[PDB]
């Protein structure tokens, strides 16, 4: 499940936070879409990508390897700090025609996804 994959991702030394959603993929059956926040001082790179995926592949298994790693500083959270998973699902799925602490995070997530 998603919690297992998130836990494995957070376990990575360079990963601070993670939230994973499953979304229908027409080619793949289901795609594992992972939003990931690196720790302070860490920065995304073409090779950190493969390292993280290899990490998950070893920790959990190839079936749990994320299809997309979406690096972000911008996990959407309620003011008490709860992850707004429903917003993450909508953005990953392109279902974006419609308690959130910082509204500005949505625009940043949408930009990062198109990149």
């Amino acid at each position: 499940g998603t919690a297992e994959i998130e836990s494995a991702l957070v376990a990575h030394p360079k990963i601070a936070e993670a939230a994973v959603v499953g979304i229908p993929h027409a080619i793949k059956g289901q795609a594992i879409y992972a939003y990931v926040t690196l720790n302070c001082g860490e920065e995304p790179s073409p090779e950190l990508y493969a390292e993280v995926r290899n990490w998950v592949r070893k920790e959990i298994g190839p079936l749990a390897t994320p299809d997309v790693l979406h690096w972000t500083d911008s996990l959407p959270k309620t003011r008490s700090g709860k992850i707004m998973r429903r917003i993450l699902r909508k953005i990953a799925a392109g279902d974006t025609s419609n308690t959130l602490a910082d509204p500005g995070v949505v625009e940043k997530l949408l930009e990062e996804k198109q990149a």
Binding site: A3, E17, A19, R79, S80, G81, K82, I83, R85, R89
Partner: protein, 165 residues
Amino acid sequence: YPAHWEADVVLRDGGTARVRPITVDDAERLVSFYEQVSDESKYYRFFAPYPRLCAKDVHRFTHHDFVDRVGLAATIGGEFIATVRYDRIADEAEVAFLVQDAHQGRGVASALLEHIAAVARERGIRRFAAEVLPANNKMIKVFMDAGYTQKRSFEDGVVRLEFDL
């Protein structure tokens, strides 16, 4: 803060815990407390794995204006065993609590919810809202018993509970 916001509360076993505002001096206590919370309870509190608090979180969870944001701790022998807080969204505020797993079922969660409501009523909050993961039935029951009602639920199964103050 008002002196009556600090008070001894009676637990179900007949003993007491101290309920008090969380202060700027409580960073170390908060961190030690969080070490004793299970991975499962952390997940239920933040909706994702969150094994240790980032510095900005330790700061925000110990620095409050006590109008728009309030945080209270329950303590035994000076140690945090639970926290509760509200964040103004308006005269509505989001509420969250967290109890060390070993101290569940002692009446701590129920006392903290009563106390945070009492503070909110003094600061012009008209309603509490809480989001809870649907499988977290221990937490849902605490809120139910405190008089919260289910308002709606979302695509991710998350339930929105509300309480008119």
